[PDB]
Design a protein around this ligand. Sequence first.
Ligand SMILES: [Cl-]
Ligand SMILES: [Cl-]
Ligand SMILES: [Cl-]
Ligand SMILES: [Cl-]
Ligand code: NA
Length: 129
Amino acid sequence: KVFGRCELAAAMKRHGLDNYRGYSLGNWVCAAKFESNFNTQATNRNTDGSTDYGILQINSRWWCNDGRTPGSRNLCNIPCSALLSSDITASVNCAKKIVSDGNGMNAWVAWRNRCKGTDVQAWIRGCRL
Ligand SMILES: [Cl-]
Ligand SMILES: [Cl-]
Ligand SMILES: [Cl-]
Ligand SMILES: [Cl-]
Ligand code: NA
């Protein structure tokens, strides 16, 4: 599913990401924009053999099981395929654990490089939320 900008903001708020760990909704929408272009089916293979899945491009090295990342963990206790669903619940629940792991949203390199220190509120501006 490719979400609209305001549609995704509302779904993220629905699932309790707005201001989760102090990160306003616009940070999460901006991260999703640059990780996946709002596409829940996004996947991207990394040089280490791990794969990133879903609208927040959650990586199989630590967070989900895909059966093909040797030595990896599954800290969200989910198959990586669950992160590709049109329902964002699994991606949100896993993102909450990632963002709580010590480095905040810096865990998403694209957030650090493309959202951090910008006017992230622009990503939710105009939306009925
Ligand atoms: Cl915001
Ligand atoms: Cl594996
Ligand atoms: Cl949803
Ligand atoms: Cl933080
Ligand atoms: Na894994």
